[PDB]
Structures are given as structure tokens and as C-alpha cells.
């Protein structure tokens, strides 16, 4: 029963159209509880999960402040970066930042993170030890030295190892009836036809939470997994997820096939026939 | 809770 807190920040440059965009979302596992959008109205850090609505003025006032700080630094990074690579002001670029923590079943610290991306690809990341930085190019080195002098690793690790897990635990308890819930997939299989020869088998996993799941095709112990079709686990819109897999076989060799549904809401990995 | 100490690249 592991859990985690993640914060995702996206900032996009608007060549000739004013200030860049700043979206900020905060999750607890596969559930979101906060957001900030420069484009929005309130212009404050807003709740997105009802159990976060219980924190007071002190919380939101602080969180709003820090996200505007995060925005401010990012606003700057876009210009800094553009300089680094000497790119033109005419085009738009993207910056993304992600940091958080993982706790085990004992709910204690377990992992800490902090990746930084530019134009869709790693720019700099904190190593697992939380004392070292990984740069992706000559530009990103400058950032590396710059940060190794300001003591980012020092402060972040304190955050990641301490306050991150302390607050994650607080949320978990508060979102008791929501975050600690584990929904089992309502599996079932369907059968469609292409011709007088090949049929298509599709396994369905529905209403499951968390998203962690591994649907599998199998032939009495073999790997019918090279030629099949997987779909990105998709949200249902109500806090649960959906996913499916399918294979082709001539209207026949269809009773010997197996679907291996793996999810933490299931004691034993499910198996099916039709 | 948000981290309180961002720094520029």
C-alpha cells in the first residue's frame, strides 16, 4: 500500500503574445487535489479534491504565494534558457518541472524526485541520493554549477525527505475515504468478427483505482503479447480508470487464450474464458 | 504542500 505526492509544472512561452502560461497541478497517487493556472480567474491556488477544502486561510495564502514564486522563477528560466541556446524570440518553448516523494506501506520515506525539462526533454535532474545533479548538455552544465552554488540539493532533500512525506501522510488521513480506497477492475471479454476466418478478442478492465494495472494476453503459457493492441490506461472521469487489450485469431483457436488482469484490488491475478 | 525554495536554471 504505497502512496506518493507529485507536483507538475508547465510553462509555455508566448512569442509576441505577452506573458507565458503557467499550469500547476498537485496529485496524491493518481488523484489530483490542487491546481494553478495563470489563465484562470482567481489567480490563487485552488482545491480540486474536496478533502483539501478543509485546510484554512493560512494554507491557501501560503500555497498561492509559493506558486507565484514558482511561476516567477519559471517566467525567468524561459528567457535564461532562450539565451543559453541563442534561440529566436519568434518561437515558443516549453518548460516542465516535477518533484515529489514516495512512501512505503509503512508510509515512511522511500524516494525523492525533481526533474526539469525543456522542449520535451530532460534538462537537469536530481539524482536519487539528493546531493547530486545530472546535466543533459553543455548548457545544462551552467545550470548545474549555478545550482551547486546556491544549495538547491541541500534544501530540496530537506523538503523531499521531510515535509513532502509529512504532508502526504496528512492528506492520506484526510482523504481517507478517497485516497486509501482500492477499486477492483470489473473485467469481462468481448468478441467481434472481421471475416469467415479471423475474430478479434478484447479483454476489458473497468472502474479500477489506482491506474496501476497490467492486462495480458497469453497462450497456455506463451507470449501472444507481441502482436496485440494495448491502449493507454484512460480516466473514466469519476476517479477510476479503464483499459483493454485485443488479438486476432480465426474463428476457432479462441477458447485456449488467456487474459491476465493484474491489479492491487485483486487477491489473485484473474483469468478468463468465452 | 509546495516546496518553498525554487531557483532559476
Amino acid at each position: 500500500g504505497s502512496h506518493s505526492m507529485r507536483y507538475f509544472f508547465t510553462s509555455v512561452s508566448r512569442p509576441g503574445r505577452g506573458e507565458p502560461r503557467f499550469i500547476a497541478v498537485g496529485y496524491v497517487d493518481d488523484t489530483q487535489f490542487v491546481r494553478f493556472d495563470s489563465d484562470a480567474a482567481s489567480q490563487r491556488m485552488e482545491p480540486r479534491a474536496p478533502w483539501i477544502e478543509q485546510e484554512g486561510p493560512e494554507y491557501w495564502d501560503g500555497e498561492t504565494r509559493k506558486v507565484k514564486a514558482h511561476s516567477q522563477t519559471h517566467r525567468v528560466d524561459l528567457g535564461t534558457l532562450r539565451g543559453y541556446y541563442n534561440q529566436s524570440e519568434a518561437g515558443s518553448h516549453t518548460v516542465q518541472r516535477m518533484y515529489g516523494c514516495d512512501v512505503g506501506s509503512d508510509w515512511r520515506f522511500l524516494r525523492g524526485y525533481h526533474q526539469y525539462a525543456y522542449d520535451g526533454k530532460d534538462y537537469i535532474a536530481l539524482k536519487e541520493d539528493l546531493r547530486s545533479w545530472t546535466a543533459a548538455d553543455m548548457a545544462a552544465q551552467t545550470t548545474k554549477h549555478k545550482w551547486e552554488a546556491a544549495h538547491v540539493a541541500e534544501q530540496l532533500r530537506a523538503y523531499l525527505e521531510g515535509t513532502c512525506v509529512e504532508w502526504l501522510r496528512r492528506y492520506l488521513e484526510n482523504g481517507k475515504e478517497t485516497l486509501q480506497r482500492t477499486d477492483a477492475p470489473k473485467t469481462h471479454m468481448t468478441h467481434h468478427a472481421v471475416s469467415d476466418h479471423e475474430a478479434t478478442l478484447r479483454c476489458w478492465a473497468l472502474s479500477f483505482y489506482p491506474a496501476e494495472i497490467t492486462l495480458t494476453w497469453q497462450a497456455d503459457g506463451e507470449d501472444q503479447t507481441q502482436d496485440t493492441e494495448l491502449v493507454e490506461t484512460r480516466p473514466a472521469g469519476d476517479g477510476t480508470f479503464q483499459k483493454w487489450a485485443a488479438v486476432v485469431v480465426p474463428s476457432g483457436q479462441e477458447q485456449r487464450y488467456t487474459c491476465h488482469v493484474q491489479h492491487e484490488g485483486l487477491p489473485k491475478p484473474l483469468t478468463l474464458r468465452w | 504542500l509546495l516546496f518553498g525554495y525554487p531557483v532559476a536554471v
Partner: T-cell receptor
Amino acid sequence: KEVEQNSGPLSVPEGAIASLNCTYSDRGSQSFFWYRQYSGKSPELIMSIYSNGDKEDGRFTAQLNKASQYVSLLIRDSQPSDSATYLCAVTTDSWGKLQFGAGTQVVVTP
Amino acid sequence: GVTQTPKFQVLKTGQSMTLQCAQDMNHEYMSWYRQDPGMGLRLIHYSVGAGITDQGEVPNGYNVSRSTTEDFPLRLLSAAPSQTSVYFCASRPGLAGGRPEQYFGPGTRLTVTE
């Protein structure tokens, strides 16, 4: 309001231990400090704690309990020179307003 | 570090004066406080960067500017007997990075009189 340093008028003999307590109200606090202010002078930052636990570097020892939102500073080996008033500061972020306690006046009696 | 002048200053109700403050640490977040026996430290004004300035717990009686990132001049237009206190100017990195530690300046003492 926000931060409360236990007692204004205080005292302690030589070679002893001096315990200063501090209590803050914003659960979201993430950075805690201890300042020392000699009468007629400016507060000289003397201790910073970023994780809850025990930091004991020097003759000073700092404790942080986030669960109880409490901050400590125990001065092992009392010298009369330590005679000064100790200020306790706490904040949330790089943009949060530093918050001080009325300060607890300490007195090393020879 | 943080420097500020004058050290001591005596004044007459209605007189104008400007307390100087400087920091040689490339900090973005400078502040001004006044210390009184009954209240301890109390913020007057504060700035997080250049051209940025904002009210504090007691901004009545003080003005403040921030043209450069190294200086943060506190201004008393027309002095008042209640302005009598000790003024400490402090600075912080802010979004600049480094030790999230705030450092105080030596302070200035001011006694006003009708």
C-alpha cells in the same frame, strides 16, 4: 500572535545548560532560525534548521519537532558572554514573511 | 554584508530623513523593521526585488524605494515623536538562491523631539 517564545525575563548560572523554547502556528512553516541579540546591537543569526530533528553544531543544539510545531535551542556550557536575548524566527518560503518571537531574555549569572 | 547609516540620529518633529541600507550579496528580498521594548521586531516596509515595494505591519510614517537591487532607502517625510526607535534593515536572497537565511544590518537609533 504567531510565534511565542516562552518567557521574557529569564536567568541561568555558569557552565550550565540554557533551554529556549519556541512555538509557531503555521503548520506550513519550513525554515526555522535562532538569532542572538546583544543589547544595543543587531541580531546575529546563530542557528538554522531545515528538517525536524536535532542539529548540534557548535556549543549550541537546535531541536525541531514539526508534529508539535516546537523549536529548541539548548546552550551547553554557559559563558557570561552568552548573556543576550534570543530571537526565534520561522517562515514558509523564500517569499514568506519571517516571523519572530518577542524574544526570550537570557542571563548567564557568574 | 548588510550596511546601514547613520548610526545615531536625533530629530525634531516634522524633519525629513532617509535611513540608508545596502547589501553586497546579490539578494533580492530586502526589508526594514523597527524594534521597540513592548513589541520586539515589527516590519515597516519590504521589497522582494528591484522596483518592487510593499506595505508591512506598520507602513504609516514611512516611504521606501528600490531602484537598485543593492540599496533600500527608508524615508521619513515629517518626523514624529512616535518614530523614536531602533531601525534594522535586513536582506534575504529571495528567488536568487542560496541559504534561506536573513541577515540584519547594524541598525540606527533615532530619538525625535518636539
